[PDB]
Amino acid sequence: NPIHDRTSDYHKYLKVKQGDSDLFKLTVSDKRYIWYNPDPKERDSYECGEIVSETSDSFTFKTVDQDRQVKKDDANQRNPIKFDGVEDMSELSYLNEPAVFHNLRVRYNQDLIYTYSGLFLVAVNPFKRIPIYTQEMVDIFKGRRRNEVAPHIFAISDVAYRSMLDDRQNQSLLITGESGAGKTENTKKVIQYLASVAGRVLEQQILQANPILEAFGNAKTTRNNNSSRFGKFIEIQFNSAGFISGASIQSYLLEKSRVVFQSETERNYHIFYQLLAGATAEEKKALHLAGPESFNYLNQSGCVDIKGVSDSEEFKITRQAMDIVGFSQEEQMSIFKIIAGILHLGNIKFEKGAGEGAVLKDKTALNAASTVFGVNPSVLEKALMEPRILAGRDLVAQHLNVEKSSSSRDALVKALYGRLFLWLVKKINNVLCQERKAYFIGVLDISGFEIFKVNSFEQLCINYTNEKLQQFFNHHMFKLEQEEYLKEKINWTFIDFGLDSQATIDLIDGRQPPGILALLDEQSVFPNATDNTLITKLHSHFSKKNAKYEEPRFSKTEFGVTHYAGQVMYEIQDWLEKNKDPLQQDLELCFKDSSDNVVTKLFNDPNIASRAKKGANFITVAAQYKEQLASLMATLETTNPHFVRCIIPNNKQLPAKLEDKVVLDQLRCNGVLEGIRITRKGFPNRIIYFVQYRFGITKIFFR
Ligand SMILES: Nc1ncnc2c1ncn2[C@@H]1O[C@H](COP(=O)(O)OP(=O)(O)O)[C@@H](O)[C@H]1O
Ligand SMILES: Cc1cccc2c1C(=O)[C@]1(O)CCN(c3ccccc3)C1=N2
Ligand code: VO4
Ligand SMILES: [Mg+2]
Ligand SMILES: [Mg+2]
């Protein structure tokens, strides 16, 4: 049994190393210690000081360098060192910030990235490979109770699986974290584990879905070299016997704007680099491809390579995944034609004509795009610069200037890419959905909280999604838990854990009074609206009124929202157009006539191509966002949730570099210490009267 065998890999990689006699000496010491701030300005930078004396209300302790005094009520005592490395921190004698951080630090120093924090798992990103996810590791966890084995993402996965069987109830695994924290990597491990322990081709296809989604939906940002630019909820489906019977991927709104623009040092989606790097000699000839430097959509950020990544090798992996999932050779070629055509479209250079209208003097890129997409270049050209619209009921050809022609070209590109992405997901789902499920375990992997030098509409929706997920944790850990105690009248005094995202949520998504998204929508159908009338409206409603909103004095085009994870300043430029998400009908007519079997589906299949109406306007992105989020939240409320809190160690994507204030900020806004306290102070288990304890109105509550 590897669990008891101290030579095993399990012991080596998942267990705290045996301390030595010098450490035993320290462990049985009568000395007592405190965590203190050498600099009272720097509340997150702690050192250890020996407590040398005490009064009834104070401690005196030595500093690393001198003696200081502190009220006992303000003291962060250090735990006896026998607790250092503890697997479940609800066991600590002293639950404070530097103690919780210290335990995570001891474990992390030994590459022990997983730690329990009472009922939920904490996962600190190692930023290096640790060999704890082999089949041999999977096999050790299979069937084991949480307290029988070391902390691991596999153990929580197994717990949910047995709960699903024993309780005949759907489960969810909700993996939280800021950008780069490890949500996607842990999501993949859960799927790996479930497919293995409950498996019977289908399993291999479930796994191979991932390189396809990542190639098209992930990109280098300044926060993560492999950032998910779309959120997903993966349902792993099980029959009544508990075997895997299928899977379904709900994908959420994709950051389409990245196709046409990337900030300095970032990349576009990985697939662009993968094609250019990995294509055959005359794949490249057939698609008129050159290197990334030659394409406007890949040559702006100054970054075309990711350290440690071979895009040509990744392309091979993407294509192998497409084969396994079952995309035909013709389908793959059309996918790649769409990618190439998008790059060509980006190379179209509109110029001023004799008048205000734009012209295309060089048609090389137009012609190359049209050839690969299988559309008529003359029709495309007219649709870009001279699209027809109604004015009342009259049909009027516009003549767009350079900036509008360029923005229409970008709108086409983003629609092609977003529709392509939806089509990939649909094709995958058709393969993976082969049986009506009896049960599911859903794994949620959102785009995580993020802050850049410039934050736009996409960042607000992303950060709002993270705020809502944190609120879901708060609801389940604190609110529902105490509501139950209180309804069962079990002698409980209600505790205000001071974690409530409600104010920020209402600010963003309020309906009456209208919140930010509501006002955005109102401005979006207002014919005279501009990005300036929009910001003016937001300030008018919220400035000096809403405690989570700030009208900055340093800018006229930004507003601040205080999120659980910190204040973010949002730039309003392009929000009206981003929300309306327009696309000239004439461009759709052009592509509806494509000779390509995949391109034609993107434009004629209503599930991919149609857009809902709300009265006399197309549904806005904000309304679409809201619908998708409401849908997810409704599904989650039908499951039993399990939470995994991913924690990023630093903001450099480096191993062995745990940063105090980076980590402590997350422990605070995540509610980790609050979550430990409710575990300790409360009554986790209750049973209708069955036939340290509490008798309720209908149930016996226990610890
Ligand atoms: N458990 C892990 N083992 C090894 N590397 C990891 C682990 N978790 C995260 N990483 C590294 O951190 C990067 C970002 O993690 P990821 O899961 O993509 O973040 P996100 O939370 O943004 O989905 C990964 O690409 C990988 O290099
Ligand atoms: C998880 C989730 C649920 C509902 C909507 C979501 C997400 C998400 O996590 C996202 O798919 C990530 C990006 N995003 C988005 C992109 C552009 C504009 C607006 C939003 C997201 N929207
Ligand atoms: O960087 V992550 O968007 O995958 O949170
Ligand atoms: Mg991710
Ligand atoms: Mg600024």
Side-chain angles (χ1 to χ4, degrees), residues 177-184 218 221 223-224 226-230 445-450 462 466:
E178 66 181 77
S179 181
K183 299 182 293 306
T184 293
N218 288 40
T221 72
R223 286 175 179 257
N224 185 357
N226 194 38
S227 191
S228 305
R229 309 313 297 162
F230 70 105
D445 185 20
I446 66 170
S447 292
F449 194 91
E450 65 184 22
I462 288 169
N466 284 260

mmCIF file with all atom_site columns, all heavy atoms in Angstrom, residues 177-184 218 221 223-224 226-230 445-450 462 466, ligand 3:
data_model
loop_
_atom_site.group_PDB
_atom_site.id
_atom_site.type_symbol
_atom_site.label_atom_id
_atom_site.label_alt_id
_atom_site.label_comp_id
_atom_site.label_asym_id
_atom_site.label_entity_id
_atom_site.label_seq_id
_atom_site.pdbx_PDB_ins_code
_atom_site.Cartn_x
_atom_site.Cartn_y
_atom_site.Cartn_z
_atom_site.occupancy
_atom_site.B_iso_or_equiv
_atom_site.pdbx_formal_charge
_atom_site.auth_seq_id
_atom_site.auth_comp_id
_atom_site.auth_asym_id
_atom_site.auth_atom_id
_atom_site.pdbx_PDB_model_num
ATOM   1   N N   . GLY A 1 177 ? -10.476 31.479 -9.354  1.00 0.00 ? 177 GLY A N   1
ATOM   2   C CA  . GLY A 1 177 ? -9.159  32.058 -9.323  1.00 0.00 ? 177 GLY A CA  1
ATOM   3   C C   . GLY A 1 177 ? -8.980  33.217 -10.267 1.00 0.00 ? 177 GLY A C   1
ATOM   4   O O   . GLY A 1 177 ? -9.689  33.332 -11.286 1.00 0.00 ? 177 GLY A O   1
ATOM   5   N N   . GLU A 1 178 ? -8.010  34.082 -9.939  1.00 0.00 ? 178 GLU A N   1
ATOM   6   C CA  . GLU A 1 178 ? -7.652  35.126 -10.892 1.00 0.00 ? 178 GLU A CA  1
ATOM   7   C C   . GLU A 1 178 ? -6.937  34.547 -12.118 1.00 0.00 ? 178 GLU A C   1
ATOM   8   O O   . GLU A 1 178 ? -6.533  33.377 -12.112 1.00 0.00 ? 178 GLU A O   1
ATOM   9   C CB  . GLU A 1 178 ? -6.816  36.201 -10.213 1.00 0.00 ? 178 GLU A CB  1
ATOM   10  C CG  . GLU A 1 178 ? -5.428  35.773 -9.732  1.00 0.00 ? 178 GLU A CG  1
ATOM   11  C CD  . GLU A 1 178 ? -4.733  36.958 -9.048  1.00 0.00 ? 178 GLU A CD  1
ATOM   12  O OE1 . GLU A 1 178 ? -5.066  37.251 -7.911  1.00 0.00 ? 178 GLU A OE1 1
ATOM   13  O OE2 . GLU A 1 178 ? -3.902  37.613 -9.679  1.00 0.00 ? 178 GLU A OE2 1
ATOM   14  N N   . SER A 1 179 ? -6.797  35.348 -13.171 1.00 0.00 ? 179 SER A N   1
ATOM   15  C CA  . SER A 1 179 ? -6.090  34.893 -14.365 1.00 0.00 ? 179 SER A CA  1
ATOM   16  C C   . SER A 1 179 ? -4.710  34.276 -14.064 1.00 0.00 ? 179 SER A C   1
ATOM   17  O O   . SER A 1 179 ? -3.932  34.865 -13.321 1.00 0.00 ? 179 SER A O   1
ATOM   18  C CB  . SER A 1 179 ? -5.912  36.075 -15.342 1.00 0.00 ? 179 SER A CB  1
ATOM   19  O OG  . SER A 1 179 ? -5.244  35.609 -16.516 1.00 0.00 ? 179 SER A OG  1
ATOM   20  N N   . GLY A 1 180 ? -4.440  33.082 -14.613 1.00 0.00 ? 180 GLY A N   1
ATOM   21  C CA  . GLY A 1 180 ? -3.136  32.397 -14.453 1.00 0.00 ? 180 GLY A CA  1
ATOM   22  C C   . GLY A 1 180 ? -3.041  31.549 -13.177 1.00 0.00 ? 180 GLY A C   1
ATOM   23  O O   . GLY A 1 180 ? -1.992  30.967 -12.906 1.00 0.00 ? 180 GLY A O   1
ATOM   24  N N   . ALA A 1 181 ? -4.111  31.499 -12.378 1.00 0.00 ? 181 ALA A N   1
ATOM   25  C CA  . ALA A 1 181 ? -4.031  30.810 -11.061 1.00 0.00 ? 181 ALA A CA  1
ATOM   26  C C   . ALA A 1 181 ? -4.009  29.278 -11.128 1.00 0.00 ? 181 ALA A C   1
ATOM   27  O O   . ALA A 1 181 ? -3.531  28.642 -10.193 1.00 0.00 ? 181 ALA A O   1
ATOM   28  C CB  . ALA A 1 181 ? -5.183  31.275 -10.098 1.00 0.00 ? 181 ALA A CB  1
ATOM   29  N N   . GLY A 1 182 ? -4.532  28.693 -12.211 1.00 0.00 ? 182 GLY A N   1
ATOM   30  C CA  . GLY A 1 182 ? -4.536  27.234 -12.404 1.00 0.00 ? 182 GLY A CA  1
ATOM   31  C C   . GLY A 1 182 ? -5.913  26.563 -12.576 1.00 0.00 ? 182 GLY A C   1
ATOM   32  O O   . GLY A 1 182 ? -6.037  25.327 -12.465 1.00 0.00 ? 182 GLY A O   1
ATOM   33  N N   . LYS A 1 183 ? -6.950  27.351 -12.876 1.00 0.00 ? 183 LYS A N   1
ATOM   34  C CA  . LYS A 1 183 ? -8.292  26.792 -13.117 1.00 0.00 ? 183 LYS A CA  1
ATOM   35  C C   . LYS A 1 183 ? -8.352  25.764 -14.245 1.00 0.00 ? 183 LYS A C   1
ATOM   36  O O   . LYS A 1 183 ? -8.931  24.683 -14.079 1.00 0.00 ? 183 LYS A O   1
ATOM   37  C CB  . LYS A 1 183 ? -9.323  27.896 -13.411 1.00 0.00 ? 183 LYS A CB  1
ATOM   38  C CG  . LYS A 1 183 ? -9.505  28.891 -12.272 1.00 0.00 ? 183 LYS A CG  1
ATOM   39  C CD  . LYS A 1 183 ? -10.582 29.949 -12.625 1.00 0.00 ? 183 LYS A CD  1
ATOM   40  C CE  . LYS A 1 183 ? -10.107 30.860 -13.781 1.00 0.00 ? 183 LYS A CE  1
ATOM   41  N NZ  . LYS A 1 183 ? -8.766  31.531 -13.542 1.00 0.00 ? 183 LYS A NZ  1
ATOM   42  N N   . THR A 1 184 ? -7.770  26.105 -15.387 1.00 0.00 ? 184 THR A N   1
ATOM   43  C CA  . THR A 1 184 ? -7.833  25.229 -16.572 1.00 0.00 ? 184 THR A CA  1
ATOM   44  C C   . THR A 1 184 ? -7.030  23.948 -16.367 1.00 0.00 ? 184 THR A C   1
ATOM   45  O O   . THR A 1 184 ? -7.481  22.863 -16.724 1.00 0.00 ? 184 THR A O   1
ATOM   46  C CB  . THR A 1 184 ? -7.365  26.015 -17.794 1.00 0.00 ? 184 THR A CB  1
ATOM   47  O OG1 . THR A 1 184 ? -8.364  27.031 -18.027 1.00 0.00 ? 184 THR A OG1 1
ATOM   48  C CG2 . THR A 1 184 ? -7.226  25.119 -19.075 1.00 0.00 ? 184 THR A CG2 1
ATOM   49  N N   . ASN A 1 218 ? -7.816  29.970 -26.505 1.00 0.00 ? 218 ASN A N   1
ATOM   50  C CA  . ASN A 1 218 ? -6.760  30.437 -25.576 1.00 0.00 ? 218 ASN A CA  1
ATOM   51  C C   . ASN A 1 218 ? -5.684  31.278 -26.282 1.00 0.00 ? 218 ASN A C   1
ATOM   52  O O   . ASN A 1 218 ? -5.456  31.123 -27.494 1.00 0.00 ? 218 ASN A O   1
ATOM   53  C CB  . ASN A 1 218 ? -6.091  29.238 -24.883 1.00 0.00 ? 218 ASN A CB  1
ATOM   54  C CG  . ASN A 1 218 ? -6.993  28.579 -23.839 1.00 0.00 ? 218 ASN A CG  1
ATOM   55  O OD1 . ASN A 1 218 ? -8.190  28.430 -24.045 1.00 0.00 ? 218 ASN A OD1 1
ATOM   56  N ND2 . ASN A 1 218 ? -6.416  28.205 -22.706 1.00 0.00 ? 218 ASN A ND2 1
ATOM   57  N N   . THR A 1 221 ? -1.861  36.286 -22.769 1.00 0.00 ? 221 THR A N   1
ATOM   58  C CA  . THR A 1 221 ? -2.027  37.638 -22.249 1.00 0.00 ? 221 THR A CA  1
ATOM   59  C C   . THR A 1 221 ? -0.816  37.974 -21.376 1.00 0.00 ? 221 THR A C   1
ATOM   60  O O   . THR A 1 221 ? 0.060   37.122 -21.163 1.00 0.00 ? 221 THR A O   1
ATOM   61  C CB  . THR A 1 221 ? -3.330  37.820 -21.372 1.00 0.00 ? 221 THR A CB  1
ATOM   62  O OG1 . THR A 1 221 ? -3.149  37.144 -20.113 1.00 0.00 ? 221 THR A OG1 1
ATOM   63  C CG2 . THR A 1 221 ? -4.589  37.268 -22.110 1.00 0.00 ? 221 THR A CG2 1
ATOM   64  N N   . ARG A 1 223 ? -0.941  38.199 -18.319 1.00 0.00 ? 223 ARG A N   1
ATOM   65  C CA  . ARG A 1 223 ? -1.136  37.432 -17.064 1.00 0.00 ? 223 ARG A CA  1
ATOM   66  C C   . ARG A 1 223 ? -0.983  35.897 -17.164 1.00 0.00 ? 223 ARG A C   1
ATOM   67  O O   . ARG A 1 223 ? -0.741  35.217 -16.159 1.00 0.00 ? 223 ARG A O   1
ATOM   68  C CB  . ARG A 1 223 ? -2.474  37.826 -16.438 1.00 0.00 ? 223 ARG A CB  1
ATOM   69  C CG  . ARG A 1 223 ? -2.374  39.213 -15.823 1.00 0.00 ? 223 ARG A CG  1
ATOM   70  C CD  . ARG A 1 223 ? -3.662  39.707 -15.304 1.00 0.00 ? 223 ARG A CD  1
ATOM   71  N NE  . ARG A 1 223 ? -3.417  41.025 -14.729 1.00 0.00 ? 223 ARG A NE  1
ATOM   72  C CZ  . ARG A 1 223 ? -3.325  41.291 -13.426 1.00 0.00 ? 223 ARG A CZ  1
ATOM   73  N NH1 . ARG A 1 223 ? -3.457  40.318 -12.520 1.00 0.00 ? 223 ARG A NH1 1
ATOM   74  N NH2 . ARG A 1 223 ? -3.100  42.541 -13.031 1.00 0.00 ? 223 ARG A NH2 1
ATOM   75  N N   . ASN A 1 224 ? -1.104  35.356 -18.371 1.00 0.00 ? 224 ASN A N   1
ATOM   76  C CA  . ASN A 1 224 ? -1.067  33.927 -18.564 1.00 0.00 ? 224 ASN A CA  1
ATOM   77  C C   . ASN A 1 224 ? -0.723  33.628 -19.997 1.00 0.00 ? 224 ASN A C   1
ATOM   78  O O   . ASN A 1 224 ? -1.446  34.070 -20.871 1.00 0.00 ? 224 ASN A O   1
ATOM   79  C CB  . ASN A 1 224 ? -2.460  33.349 -18.224 1.00 0.00 ? 224 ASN A CB  1
ATOM   80  C CG  . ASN A 1 224 ? -2.521  31.832 -18.269 1.00 0.00 ? 224 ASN A CG  1
ATOM   81  O OD1 . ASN A 1 224 ? -1.569  31.151 -18.597 1.00 0.00 ? 224 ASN A OD1 1
ATOM   82  N ND2 . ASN A 1 224 ? -3.674  31.295 -17.911 1.00 0.00 ? 224 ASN A ND2 1
ATOM   83  N N   . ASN A 1 226 ? -1.166  30.953 -21.446 1.00 0.00 ? 226 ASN A N   1
ATOM   84  C CA  . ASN A 1 226 ? -2.238  30.116 -21.964 1.00 0.00 ? 226 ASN A CA  1
ATOM   85  C C   . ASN A 1 226 ? -3.626  30.520 -21.413 1.00 0.00 ? 226 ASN A C   1
ATOM   86  O O   . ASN A 1 226 ? -4.400  29.666 -20.982 1.00 0.00 ? 226 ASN A O   1
ATOM   87  C CB  . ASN A 1 226 ? -1.944  28.627 -21.695 1.00 0.00 ? 226 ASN A CB  1
ATOM   88  C CG  . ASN A 1 226 ? -2.836  27.717 -22.508 1.00 0.00 ? 226 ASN A CG  1
ATOM   89  O OD1 . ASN A 1 226 ? -3.137  28.022 -23.667 1.00 0.00 ? 226 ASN A OD1 1
ATOM   90  N ND2 . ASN A 1 226 ? -3.293  26.623 -21.906 1.00 0.00 ? 226 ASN A ND2 1
ATOM   91  N N   . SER A 1 227 ? -3.929  31.821 -21.457 1.00 0.00 ? 227 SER A N   1
ATOM   92  C CA  . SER A 1 227 ? -5.192  32.349 -20.953 1.00 0.00 ? 227 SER A CA  1
ATOM   93  C C   . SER A 1 227 ? -6.400  31.840 -21.750 1.00 0.00 ? 227 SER A C   1
ATOM   94  O O   . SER A 1 227 ? -6.436  31.955 -22.970 1.00 0.00 ? 227 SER A O   1
ATOM   95  C CB  . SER A 1 227 ? -5.181  33.892 -21.011 1.00 0.00 ? 227 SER A CB  1
ATOM   96  O OG  . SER A 1 227 ? -6.301  34.439 -20.295 1.00 0.00 ? 227 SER A OG  1
ATOM   97  N N   . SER A 1 228 ? -7.399  31.320 -21.039 1.00 0.00 ? 228 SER A N   1
ATOM   98  C CA  . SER A 1 228 ? -8.710  31.007 -21.585 1.00 0.00 ? 228 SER A CA  1
ATOM   99  C C   . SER A 1 228 ? -9.436  32.300 -21.855 1.00 0.00 ? 228 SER A C   1
ATOM   100 O O   . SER A 1 228 ? -9.684  33.066 -20.923 1.00 0.00 ? 228 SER A O   1
ATOM   101 C CB  . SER A 1 228 ? -9.537  30.247 -20.551 1.00 0.00 ? 228 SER A CB  1
ATOM   102 O OG  . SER A 1 228 ? -8.881  29.088 -20.086 1.00 0.00 ? 228 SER A OG  1
ATOM   103 N N   . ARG A 1 229 ? -9.792  32.543 -23.121 1.00 0.00 ? 229 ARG A N   1
ATOM   104 C CA  . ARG A 1 229 ? -10.504 33.772 -23.482 1.00 0.00 ? 229 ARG A CA  1
ATOM   105 C C   . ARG A 1 229 ? -12.021 33.512 -23.675 1.00 0.00 ? 229 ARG A C   1
ATOM   106 O O   . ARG A 1 229 ? -12.750 34.360 -24.195 1.00 0.00 ? 229 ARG A O   1
ATOM   107 C CB  . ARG A 1 229 ? -9.884  34.425 -24.727 1.00 0.00 ? 229 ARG A CB  1
ATOM   108 C CG  . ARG A 1 229 ? -8.347  34.611 -24.643 1.00 0.00 ? 229 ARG A CG  1
ATOM   109 C CD  . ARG A 1 229 ? -7.891  35.228 -23.298 1.00 0.00 ? 229 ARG A CD  1
ATOM   110 N NE  . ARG A 1 229 ? -8.427  36.571 -23.108 1.00 0.00 ? 229 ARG A NE  1
ATOM   111 C CZ  . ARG A 1 229 ? -8.482  37.193 -21.934 1.00 0.00 ? 229 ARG A CZ  1
ATOM   112 N NH1 . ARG A 1 229 ? -8.024  36.595 -20.827 1.00 0.00 ? 229 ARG A NH1 1
ATOM   113 N NH2 . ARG A 1 229 ? -8.997  38.394 -21.857 1.00 0.00 ? 229 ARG A NH2 1
ATOM   114 N N   . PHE A 1 230 ? -12.472 32.365 -23.173 1.00 0.00 ? 230 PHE A N   1
ATOM   115 C CA  . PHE A 1 230 ? -13.882 31.997 -23.113 1.00 0.00 ? 230 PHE A CA  1
ATOM   116 C C   . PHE A 1 230 ? -14.003 31.140 -21.845 1.00 0.00 ? 230 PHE A C   1
ATOM   117 O O   . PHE A 1 230 ? -13.019 30.481 -21.427 1.00 0.00 ? 230 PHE A O   1
ATOM   118 C CB  . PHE A 1 230 ? -14.284 31.144 -24.343 1.00 0.00 ? 230 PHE A CB  1
ATOM   119 C CG  . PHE A 1 230 ? -13.685 29.749 -24.338 1.00 0.00 ? 230 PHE A CG  1
ATOM   120 C CD1 . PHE A 1 230 ? -14.458 28.636 -24.024 1.00 0.00 ? 230 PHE A CD1 1
ATOM   121 C CD2 . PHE A 1 230 ? -12.331 29.568 -24.612 1.00 0.00 ? 230 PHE A CD2 1
ATOM   122 C CE1 . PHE A 1 230 ? -13.876 27.327 -23.977 1.00 0.00 ? 230 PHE A CE1 1
ATOM   123 C CE2 . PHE A 1 230 ? -11.744 28.287 -24.575 1.00 0.00 ? 230 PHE A CE2 1
ATOM   124 C CZ  . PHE A 1 230 ? -12.537 27.164 -24.260 1.00 0.00 ? 230 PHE A CZ  1
ATOM   125 N N   . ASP A 1 445 ? -14.988 26.202 -15.546 1.00 0.00 ? 445 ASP A N   1
ATOM   126 C CA  . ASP A 1 445 ? -13.680 26.812 -15.804 1.00 0.00 ? 445 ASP A CA  1
ATOM   127 C C   . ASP A 1 445 ? -13.916 28.132 -16.536 1.00 0.00 ? 445 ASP A C   1
ATOM   128 O O   . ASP A 1 445 ? -13.952 28.164 -17.760 1.00 0.00 ? 445 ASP A O   1
ATOM   129 C CB  . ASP A 1 445 ? -12.858 25.890 -16.687 1.00 0.00 ? 445 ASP A CB  1
ATOM   130 C CG  . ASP A 1 445 ? -11.451 26.397 -16.911 1.00 0.00 ? 445 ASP A CG  1
ATOM   131 O OD1 . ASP A 1 445 ? -10.974 27.231 -16.112 1.00 0.00 ? 445 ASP A OD1 1
ATOM   132 O OD2 . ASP A 1 445 ? -10.822 25.950 -17.879 1.00 0.00 ? 445 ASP A OD2 1
ATOM   133 N N   . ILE A 1 446 ? -14.117 29.189 -15.778 1.00 0.00 ? 446 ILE A N   1
ATOM   134 C CA  . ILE A 1 446 ? -14.362 30.545 -16.328 1.00 0.00 ? 446 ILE A CA  1
ATOM   135 C C   . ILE A 1 446 ? -13.056 31.244 -16.725 1.00 0.00 ? 446 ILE A C   1
ATOM   136 O O   . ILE A 1 446 ? -11.960 30.815 -16.341 1.00 0.00 ? 446 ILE A O   1
ATOM   137 C CB  . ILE A 1 446 ? -15.142 31.449 -15.301 1.00 0.00 ? 446 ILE A CB  1
ATOM   138 C CG1 . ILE A 1 446 ? -14.325 31.759 -14.043 1.00 0.00 ? 446 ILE A CG1 1
ATOM   139 C CG2 . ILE A 1 446 ? -16.486 30.806 -14.881 1.00 0.00 ? 446 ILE A CG2 1
ATOM   140 C CD1 . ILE A 1 446 ? -14.989 32.847 -13.168 1.00 0.00 ? 446 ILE A CD1 1
ATOM   141 N N   . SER A 1 447 ? -13.157 32.343 -17.467 1.00 0.00 ? 447 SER A N   1
ATOM   142 C CA  . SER A 1 447 ? -12.029 33.277 -17.565 1.00 0.00 ? 447 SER A CA  1
ATOM   143 C C   . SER A 1 447 ? -11.910 34.015 -16.191 1.00 0.00 ? 447 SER A C   1
ATOM   144 O O   . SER A 1 447 ? -12.899 34.549 -15.690 1.00 0.00 ? 447 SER A O   1
ATOM   145 C CB  . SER A 1 447 ? -12.268 34.313 -18.679 1.00 0.00 ? 447 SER A CB  1
ATOM   146 O OG  . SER A 1 447 ? -12.228 33.685 -19.926 1.00 0.00 ? 447 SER A OG  1
ATOM   147 N N   . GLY A 1 448 ? -10.722 33.994 -15.591 1.00 0.00 ? 448 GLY A N   1
ATOM   148 C CA  . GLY A 1 448 ? -10.537 34.435 -14.210 1.00 0.00 ? 448 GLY A CA  1
ATOM   149 C C   . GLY A 1 448 ? -10.366 35.940 -14.138 1.00 0.00 ? 448 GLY A C   1
ATOM   150 O O   . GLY A 1 448 ? -10.137 36.616 -15.160 1.00 0.00 ? 448 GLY A O   1
ATOM   151 N N   . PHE A 1 449 ? -10.479 36.464 -12.926 1.00 0.00 ? 449 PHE A N   1
ATOM   152 C CA  . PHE A 1 449 ? -10.367 37.894 -12.668 1.00 0.00 ? 449 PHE A CA  1
ATOM   153 C C   . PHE A 1 449 ? -9.079  38.465 -13.289 1.00 0.00 ? 449 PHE A C   1
ATOM   154 O O   . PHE A 1 449 ? -7.989  37.872 -13.153 1.00 0.00 ? 449 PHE A O   1
ATOM   155 C CB  . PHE A 1 449 ? -10.389 38.152 -11.135 1.00 0.00 ? 449 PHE A CB  1
ATOM   156 C CG  . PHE A 1 449 ? -10.606 39.590 -10.781 1.00 0.00 ? 449 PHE A CG  1
ATOM   157 C CD1 . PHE A 1 449 ? -11.901 40.077 -10.586 1.00 0.00 ? 449 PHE A CD1 1
ATOM   158 C CD2 . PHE A 1 449 ? -9.514  40.460 -10.635 1.00 0.00 ? 449 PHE A CD2 1
ATOM   159 C CE1 . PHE A 1 449 ? -12.108 41.441 -10.263 1.00 0.00 ? 449 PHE A CE1 1
ATOM   160 C CE2 . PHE A 1 449 ? -9.725  41.830 -10.335 1.00 0.00 ? 449 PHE A CE2 1
ATOM   161 C CZ  . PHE A 1 449 ? -11.034 42.289 -10.137 1.00 0.00 ? 449 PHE A CZ  1
ATOM   162 N N   . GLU A 1 450 ? -9.184  39.620 -13.962 1.00 0.00 ? 450 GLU A N   1
ATOM   163 C CA  . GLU A 1 450 ? -8.013  40.164 -14.627 1.00 0.00 ? 450 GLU A CA  1
ATOM   164 C C   . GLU A 1 450 ? -8.055  41.672 -14.679 1.00 0.00 ? 450 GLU A C   1
ATOM   165 O O   . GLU A 1 450 ? -9.138  42.293 -14.820 1.00 0.00 ? 450 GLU A O   1
ATOM   166 C CB  . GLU A 1 450 ? -7.814  39.587 -16.054 1.00 0.00 ? 450 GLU A CB  1
ATOM   167 C CG  . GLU A 1 450 ? -8.916  39.943 -17.049 1.00 0.00 ? 450 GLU A CG  1
ATOM   168 C CD  . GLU A 1 450 ? -8.751  39.288 -18.436 1.00 0.00 ? 450 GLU A CD  1
ATOM   169 O OE1 . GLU A 1 450 ? -8.054  38.257 -18.544 1.00 0.00 ? 450 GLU A OE1 1
ATOM   170 O OE2 . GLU A 1 450 ? -9.352  39.803 -19.423 1.00 0.00 ? 450 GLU A OE2 1
ATOM   171 N N   . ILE A 1 462 ? -16.038 39.698 -17.667 1.00 0.00 ? 462 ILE A N   1
ATOM   172 C CA  . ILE A 1 462 ? -15.195 38.689 -17.041 1.00 0.00 ? 462 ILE A CA  1
ATOM   173 C C   . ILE A 1 462 ? -15.168 38.886 -15.525 1.00 0.00 ? 462 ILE A C   1
ATOM   174 O O   . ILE A 1 462 ? -15.346 37.942 -14.742 1.00 0.00 ? 462 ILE A O   1
ATOM   175 C CB  . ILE A 1 462 ? -13.745 38.748 -17.633 1.00 0.00 ? 462 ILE A CB  1
ATOM   176 C CG1 . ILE A 1 462 ? -13.747 38.189 -19.080 1.00 0.00 ? 462 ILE A CG1 1
ATOM   177 C CG2 . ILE A 1 462 ? -12.763 37.965 -16.714 1.00 0.00 ? 462 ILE A CG2 1
ATOM   178 C CD1 . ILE A 1 462 ? -12.438 38.458 -19.845 1.00 0.00 ? 462 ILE A CD1 1
ATOM   179 N N   . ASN A 1 466 ? -16.555 36.596 -12.306 1.00 0.00 ? 466 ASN A N   1
ATOM   180 C CA  . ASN A 1 466 ? -15.775 36.205 -11.103 1.00 0.00 ? 466 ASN A CA  1
ATOM   181 C C   . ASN A 1 466 ? -16.422 36.683 -9.801  1.00 0.00 ? 466 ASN A C   1
ATOM   182 O O   . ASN A 1 466 ? -16.481 35.931 -8.818  1.00 0.00 ? 466 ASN A O   1
ATOM   183 C CB  . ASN A 1 466 ? -14.352 36.750 -11.214 1.00 0.00 ? 466 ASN A CB  1
ATOM   184 C CG  . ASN A 1 466 ? -13.511 35.932 -12.191 1.00 0.00 ? 466 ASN A CG  1
ATOM   185 O OD1 . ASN A 1 466 ? -12.731 35.081 -11.765 1.00 0.00 ? 466 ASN A OD1 1
ATOM   186 N ND2 . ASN A 1 466 ? -13.667 36.178 -13.486 1.00 0.00 ? 466 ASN A ND2 1
HETATM 187 O O1  . VO4 B 2 .   ? -5.890  33.372 -17.624 1.00 0.00 ? 3   VO4 B O1  1
HETATM 188 V V1  . VO4 B 2 .   ? -7.305  32.359 -17.222 1.00 0.00 ? 3   VO4 B V1  1
HETATM 189 O O2  . VO4 B 2 .   ? -8.627  33.530 -18.435 1.00 0.00 ? 3   VO4 B O2  1
HETATM 190 O O3  . VO4 B 2 .   ? -7.622  31.036 -18.209 1.00 0.00 ? 3   VO4 B O3  1
HETATM 191 O O4  . VO4 B 2 .   ? -8.279  32.798 -15.844 1.00 0.00 ? 3   VO4 B O4  1
#
